């Protein structure tokens, strides 16, 4: 009541592997500031001062 | 005796000297020309130690807000107390000083 083993591997639908994982095709990035951005007394996002 | 009511001072704060310095040093007649440290978006370190800086001021800081010390080391404003901010430090507290 069963078929042969050489045939059953041709029976199954071979799914398509894309090996490119689809990551950055929709990604809206944002530039990272290397230097720290702080607030002055007006509340404005300035660089961190060189006063240490 | 009525003077024994005022025998021991009943303090409702701990950093009281940091508040009375904000009103006694501008009473000096040379020192009304903006010789003042700001409190709204800036802060002064009161205490450092064990990676916990207690910061005077920072009146508009949010709970869990990232702060930066002037040494470059960053921190997180975790306790927002009535007169200071308890800031945990994201590095070594060796570079943070009082003031």
């Amino acid at each position: 009541d069963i078929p042969s083993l050489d045939k059953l591997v041709s029976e199954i639908k071979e799914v398509v592997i894309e090996e490119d994982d689809g990551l950055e095709e929709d990604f809206k990035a944002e530039a990272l500031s290397s230097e720290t951005v702080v607030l002055n007394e007006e509340g404005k996002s300035v660089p961190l001062p060189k006063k240490n | 005796k009525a003077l024994d009511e005022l025998r021991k001072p009943k303090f409702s704060s701990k950093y009281l000297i940091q508040h009375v310095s904000q009103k006694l040093i501008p009473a000096v007649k040379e020192w009304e020309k903006s010789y003042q440290p700001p409190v709204i978006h800036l802060g002064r370190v009161l205490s450092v130690g064990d990676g916990i800086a207690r910061v005077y001021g920072l009146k508009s800081v949010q709970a869990g807000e990232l702060v930066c010390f002037d040494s470059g080391v960053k921190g997180m404003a975790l306790n927002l107390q009535a007169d200071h901010v308890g800031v945990v430090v994201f590095g070594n507290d060796s570079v943070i000083h009082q003031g």
Side-chain angles (χ1 to χ4, degrees):
Chain A
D1 283 346
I2 63 165
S4 178
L5 202 55
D6 266 11
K7 187 259 297 177
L8 272 180
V9 198
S10 295
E11 283 287 329
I12 47 179
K13 188 260 182 180
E14 322 91 341
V15 294
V16 166
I17 298 138
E18 296 80 25
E19 67 266 12
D20 198 74
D21 58 56
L23 280 164
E24 61 269 15
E25 280 81 2
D26 291 330
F27 183 73
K28 294 142 285 295
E30 185 176 2
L32 301 185
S33 158
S34 76
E35 49 90 19
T36 308
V37 177
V38 300
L39 300 196
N40 49 10
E41 268 305 309
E42 281 86 4
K44 265 81 163 179
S45 66
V46 302
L48 177 73
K50 297 302 289 290
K51 176 65 179 66
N52 191 299
Chain B
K1 172 61 68 188
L3 210 60
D4 275 26
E5 307 206 5
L6 309 185
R7 187 45 59 99
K8 296 297 177 181
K10 329 293 302 168
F11 288 134
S12 44
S13 165
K14 177 200 181 78
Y15 309 101
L16 166 64
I17 187 61
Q18 266 67 65
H19 176 74
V20 307
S21 315
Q22 292 192 335
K23 301 211 172 173
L24 278 190
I25 82 168
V28 186
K29 192 55 69 179
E30 326 178 29
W31 290 344
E32 292 91 337
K33 51 179 77 67
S34 178
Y35 291 158
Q36 179 264 357
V39 299
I40 313 296
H41 301 258
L42 264 72
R44 290 185 290 106
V45 189
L46 303 155
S47 307
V48 203
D50 305 327
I52 302 281
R54 299 181 194 271
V55 177
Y56 189 78
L58 283 167
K59 303 300 190 70
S60 68
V61 78
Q62 308 171 283
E65 183 180 332
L66 183 76
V67 289
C68 194
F69 293 88
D70 48 353
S71 305
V73 56
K74 298 191 308 301
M76 174 172 49
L78 212 59
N79 284 135
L80 264 62
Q81 309 276 330
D83 45 357
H84 64 108
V85 178
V87 166
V88 312
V89 180
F90 283 157
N92 213 20
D93 52 284
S94 292
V95 287
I96 319 168
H97 293 237
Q98 172 215 21

